Design a protein around this ligand. Structure first.
Ligand SMILES: *[C@@H]1O[C@H](CO)[C@@H](O[C@@H]2O[C@H](CO)[C@@H](O[C@H]3O[C@H](CO)[C@@H](O[C@@H]4O[C@H](CO)[C@@H](O)[C@H](O)[C@@H]4O)[C@H](O)[C@@H]3O)[C@H](O)[C@H]2NC(C)=O)[C@H](O)[C@H]1NC(C)=O
Ligand SMILES: *[C@@H]1O[C@H](CO)[C@@H](O[C@@H]2O[C@H](CO)[C@@H](O[C@@H]3O[C@H](CO)[C@@H](O)[C@H](O)[C@@H]3O)[C@H](O)[C@H]2NC(C)=O)[C@H](O)[C@H]1NC(C)=O
Ligand SMILES: OCC1O[C@H](O[C@@H]2OC(CO)[C@@H](O)[C@H](O)[C@H]2O)[C@H](O)[C@@H](O)[C@@H]1O
Ligand SMILES: *[C@@H]1O[C@H](CO)[C@@H](O)[C@H](O)[C@H]1NC(C)=O
Ligand SMILES: [Fe+3]
Ligand SMILES: [Zn+2]
Ligand SMILES: [Zn+2]
Length: 341
């Protein structure tokens, strides 16, 4: 009832969820699945209540009747007065990032190069860049465009997984969960940083959070912002400070979804959970911080300031916006009134 079952994707999120569970006095409990799609199915069956999803998955979930409940909100600049929970979301910038040293690589010479994607079906890592590439190429053979990639969630024996590395034992290659070394925003940026790929499709924030000492992780220690460039759609390369004028799209923020019949209850529990474990929460950083996990973005993104209420009781189509929704519909004609399960 006032007990919510959260769905965790893979073993590291499970571990974080368990801690949250313990600290919440079991107001929150945990179910675990190997992929986000499987978590969506748990939610449909009523065996889990909720999870926080990237926009590409909100589209999947939406067709099956799930609804957005609250949205990640990061630090803003305009609307200084408003409380975080009431502040409108701004959205993130999807970018394509390369090494400065890889000169003469631009948007127009990406063909046959190596790519790093957060996961198949995700906004910045897949839907935006592959949608543009299909568009520009006039062809649904997006699996042939790059020579090799790491795109968690594709066929492990395909060239889309050739660059994925699996877990510290080499198992679970290309699975779309954090066990895969190059999964997610951080994984795809690591894939570029280690020069496994030529380009990473991530968001603007990922570059800043993993360079110039912001990350203490071994692979990101010595990374410098100046060693990276953004690829712009006009064929130019720009410094990472110019993301405002050099992105592939603005993406809708990740948001918590649930079955509509459970939305109201998930919302109230979460609002109270963040008062306890959120940014300035009563027990964070004392006992547990919901929005921390050492740059690994477990359950929620680490840069989340709060979960915010949605202005308008959005359907998922309204939450995603008509320009994003049509982009996805078009790309999925290669790979409408449905539910995949
Ligand atoms: C692309 O993404 C980056 C990363 O999100 C965006 O850069 C962020 O811009 C914010 C303003 O919108 C900065 O906000 C404030 O944050 C703090 C405190 O208020 C200040 O500096 C911080 O100091 C502490 C030191 O302990 C650290 O936690 C932080 O790393 C940072 O050094 C800052 O003066 C400012 O008031 C925010 O810092 C900043 N994030 C980083 C890491 O630089 C960027 O706007 C975005 N670009 C676009 C076009 O969206
Ligand atoms: C890949 O190309 C397809 C085909 O063009 C793109 O789909 C098209 O997107 C545009 C812009 O969102 C749609 O037009 C819009 O119509 C509304 C309503 O009139 C208007 O308010 C907007 O100003 C705009 O004109 C268009 O309907 C849509 N076309 C199709 C076939 O549905 C798609 O966006 C491209 N993918 C990417 C990632 O850009
Ligand atoms: O993509 C930007 C963005 O918009 C979101 O929702 C909304 O987008 C439109 C039209 O583009 C609209 O109709 C809305 O009213 C609207 O709010 C996001 O979810 C979001 O966070 C974005 O950043
Ligand atoms: C658990 O939820 C109950 C019901 O609102 C509430 O009394 C209590 O504050 C919650 N405990 C924690 C630690 O979240
Ligand atoms: Fe995303
Ligand atoms: Zn723009
Ligand atoms: Zn509406």
């Amino acid at each position: 009832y006032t007990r919510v079952v959260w769905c965790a994707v893979g073993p590291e999120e499970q571990k974080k969820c368990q801690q949250w569970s313990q600290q919440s006095g079991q107001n929150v409990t945990c179910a675990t699945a190997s992929t986000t799609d499987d978590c969506i199915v748990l939610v449909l069956k009523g065996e889990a209540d909720a999870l926080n999803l990237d926009g590409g998955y909100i589209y999947t979930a939406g067709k099956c009747g799930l609804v957005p409940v609250l949205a990640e909100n990061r630090k803003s600049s305009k609307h200084s007065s408003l409380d975080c929970v009431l502040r409108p979301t701004e959205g993130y910038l999807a970018v394509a990032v390369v090494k400065k040293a890889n000169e003469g690589l631009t948007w127009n010479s990406l063909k046959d190069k190596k790519s790093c994607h957060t996961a198949v079906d995700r906004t910045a890592g897949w839907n935006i860049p592959m949608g543009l590439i299909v568009n520009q190429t006039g062809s649904c053979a997006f699996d042939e465009f790059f020579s090799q990639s790491c795109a968690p969630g594709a066929d492990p024996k395909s060239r889309l997984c050739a660059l994925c590395a699996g877990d510290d034992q080499g198992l679970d290659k290309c699975v779309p969960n954090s066990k895969e070394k190059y999964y997610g925003y951080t994984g795809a940026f690591r894939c570029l940083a280690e020069d496994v790929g030529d380009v990473a499709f991530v968001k603007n924030d990922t570059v800043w959070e993993n360079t110039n000492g912001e990350s203490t992780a071994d692979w990101a220690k010595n990374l410098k912002r100046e060693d990276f460039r953004l690829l712009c759609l006009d064929g130019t390369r720009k410094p990472v400070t110019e993301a405002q004028s050099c992105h592939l799209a603005v993406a809708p923020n990740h948001a918590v979804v649930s079955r509509s019949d459970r939305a109201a209850h998930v919302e109230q529990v979460l609002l109270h959970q963040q008062a306890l474990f959120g940014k300035n929460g009563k027990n964070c950083p004392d006992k547990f911080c919901l929005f921390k996990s050492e740059t690994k973005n477990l359950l929620f993104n680490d840069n989340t300031e709060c979960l915010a209420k949605l202005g308008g009781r959005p359907t998922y189509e309204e939450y995603l916006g008509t320009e994003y929704v049509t982009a996805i519909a078009n790309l999925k004609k290669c790979s409408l009134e449905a539910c995949a399960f």
